[PDB]
Design an enzyme around this catalytic site. Structure first.
Site, PDB file in Angstrom:
ATOM      1  CG  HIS A 102      -0.094  -7.221  14.657  1.00  0.00           C
ATOM      2  ND1 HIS A 102       0.645  -6.469  13.749  1.00  0.00           N
ATOM      3  CD2 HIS A 102       0.736  -7.426  15.711  1.00  0.00           C
ATOM      4  CE1 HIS A 102       1.832  -6.217  14.256  1.00  0.00           C
ATOM      5  NE2 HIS A 102       1.914  -6.795  15.444  1.00  0.00           N
ATOM      6  CG  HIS A 105       0.567   3.525   7.871  1.00  0.00           C
ATOM      7  ND1 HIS A 105       1.041   4.202   8.975  1.00  0.00           N
ATOM      8  CD2 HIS A 105       1.092   2.278   7.942  1.00  0.00           C
ATOM      9  CE1 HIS A 105       1.807   3.398   9.688  1.00  0.00           C
ATOM     10  NE2 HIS A 105       1.857   2.224   9.084  1.00  0.00           N
ATOM     11  CG  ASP A 155       2.018  -5.302   4.934  1.00  0.00           C
ATOM     12  OD1 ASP A 155       3.042  -6.041   4.822  1.00  0.00           O
ATOM     13  OD2 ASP A 155       1.609  -4.848   6.024  1.00  0.00           O
TER      14      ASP A 155
END
Lengths: 395, 381
Positions: free
Chosen positions: B219, B259, B314
């Site tokens: 996470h 994703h 990210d």
């Protein structure tokens, strides 16, 4: 469709615990708690059972205890994580602040089948050291650590109170630790499961478990029952209080009813007996017991037919109180966590080691439709300028 | 008897807050696209307010809001010390967790109340700034310090963290970062916090549990993973080779790509890439990382673009943070994520407890031993 409360949703499998809600049987790794207590088991044996899957041999138990006792030594900054807090803080909140400190410092933790059980075992000892210091801080006593003794329960009681506990007290505390070790997958266990599902460390998992437990829908259950007895004050007043507040529905009968037990809680059956014996020697506590049993009959007669009976927390407070623990600061909820830390860690290991999956549920969108962003400047329009914008002479 | 693995197909609540179009690559907050929000120059405070109140604030509303948030800039010495008494090698998010845990304990008068939940959340967003400033300072062995009131939260944060006046470019980038990470789906952090407040536990405990989940490498650590990946490549001319040696053979995953929802370019990544290019261009070592990053990006897209695998948020976020001045160590970027996400968390907790309260208590399937008689220890083996 929303799975409200995740009710009836299976989040995992477990080998650890099962409940028969209709017969009122609670089993740990196949063993009934009524049978465990009647046989005089040590809480350490039941800890071992949870972490290893079977009851220990003498040598295994001897080794297990050594590992647990290493946890009796915790760093001062973990103790200070407790003592720097306002003394008014919930005891379980104090536990949370200490374990969070511990979670931060444990930079070499790794989920590893080779070390998970030792880590957990030592943590059960650390949880005793923590709880001892939470209690002492709340009571404005000097800090102190548990020391090795014939039993884990004895080491905890003696250090918490700074005196030698009686055999009867030690035994009662031993039973309490055993009885509260595990139970289904409540909000605390679930929150911890969610945390370790990211492969977050064991300590953070416990931290999140404590965060859920802090809430009045999970924690505070034993305290609520006592507050209820104290509200009644006198035994002759039970029926009047019962009538004015329960039957007409102004408040809930605390320590009655359960999501799974549609019969007497086996934990409650055991606690009731202990509560009678121990409280019988403290006049002020025995009165609370007498109020509790008198109320109990009114409850069973009113709600017994709807599967509503005494649960574990109807008498547990009286037992804790007889031992010497006060009602303030939700200390009984912290005693619950001291016990439950075994189930928590056992479930976390089971999850991470054999059924690991990142937890990531969904939300149904019911919000505003797409719209264009309006800069703040044009958000509150000047009424006069706006009205004058497409206006012409009309007279 | 069926296990809902990862709770992946389970609806845990409804929300009005956030939605994603994974095909178009659109992220919307209360109906507003982040692309449109950033292009129009919103302050993050406007977006905090959007999350807590359900609409964009008027000038008057924003002004009152900022005042309440700024009250959060003063936090007790024991919350600061909950950080500083910790080993400096401690994980940044872990430091945050210990701080919020102490705060949760001290807040003995918190009550869920429709009338007060939002003022509490607002001040907490300011406390979260104060906490993150001191987490950063402790990791760097700097003296403790608090943010000061100004017209921009982003600026109050940056100036307190570094002890210098941040440039407009740096402030803008941070303000954008705070907006872009405010909320997204219902990950383990939002989820753990939701489980805690479902017991009516306090907002701070709820945040504490969210941090507990965010600390995990499945996470947290995503921005950091991508940076470490550019650094193992070392030179831009080495990219193609590194890509063959590590990605094509399946030895490690391409970090910051792919994703669960976006089958196209992540809208947060598109915005972050532009900032990363501009801000890094002025810092040679950081620029070096951006050049590796963009060169790798092309290889990733030619190889995986057809399966809907593109750069996510990210991929460039780390470069933005590094250009602002935040280092790779101690997962500080994940702490910066938590700083932003604290708005979404609290907004989700409020939405849940106020309007759809239900104790969260799932089930486990028993697959352990059948009934057996207890055997006293004397007679074992």
């Amino acid at each position: 469709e929303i799975s409200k409360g995740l009710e009836d949703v299976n989040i995992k499998w477990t080998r650890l615990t099962t409940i028969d809600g209709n017969k009122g049987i609670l089993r740990y790794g196949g063993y009934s708690v009524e049978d465990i207590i009647a046989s005089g088991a040590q809480d350490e044996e039941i800890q071992y059972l949870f972490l290893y899957g079977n009851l220990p041999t003498e040598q295994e138990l001897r080794k297990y205890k050594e590992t647990v006792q290493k946890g009796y030594k915790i760093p001062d900054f973990v103790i200070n994580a407790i003592r720097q807090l306002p003394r008014e803080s919930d005891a379980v909140a104090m536990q949370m602040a200490a374990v969070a400190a511990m979670a931060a410092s444990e930079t070499k933790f790794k989920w590893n089948k080779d070390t998970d059980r030792d880590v957990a075992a030592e943590m059960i000892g650390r949880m005793s050291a923590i709880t001892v210091n939470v209690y002492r801080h709340i009571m404005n006593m000097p800090a102190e650590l548990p020391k090795p003794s014939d039993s884990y329960a004895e080491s905890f009681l003696n250090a918490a109170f700074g005196r030698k506990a009686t055999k009867e007290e030690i035994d009662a505390m031993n039973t309490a630790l055993i009885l509260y070790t595990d139970h289904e997958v409540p909000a605390s266990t679930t929150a911890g499961l969610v945390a370790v599902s990211t492969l977050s460390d064991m300590y953070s998992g416990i931290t999140a478990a404590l965060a859920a437990l802090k809430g009045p829908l999970h924690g505070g259950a034993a305290e609520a029952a006592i507050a209820q007895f104290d509200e009644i004050k006198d035994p002759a007043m039970v029926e009047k209080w019962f009538n004015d507040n329960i039957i007409n529905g102004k408040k809930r009968l605390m320590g009655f009813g359960h999501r799974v037990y549609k019969t007497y809680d086996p934990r409650a059956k055991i606690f009731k007996g202990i509560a009678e014996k121990l409280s019988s020697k403290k006049p002020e506590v025995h009165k609370v017991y007498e109020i509790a049993t008198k109320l109990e009959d009114f409850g069973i007669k009113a709600f017994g037919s709807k599967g509503i009976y005494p649960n574990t927390d109807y008498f547990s407070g009286i037992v804790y109180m007889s031992i010497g623990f006060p009602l303030r600061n939700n200390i009984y909820t912290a005693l619950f966590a001291l016990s439950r830390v075994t189930g928590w860690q056992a479930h976390f290991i089971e999850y991470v080691e054999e059924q690991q999956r990142l937890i990531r549920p969904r939300a149904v969108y019911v919000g505003p439709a797409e719209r264009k962003y309006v800069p703040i400047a044009e958000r509150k329009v000047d009424k006069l300028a706006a009205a004058l914008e497409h206006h012409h002479h009309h007279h």
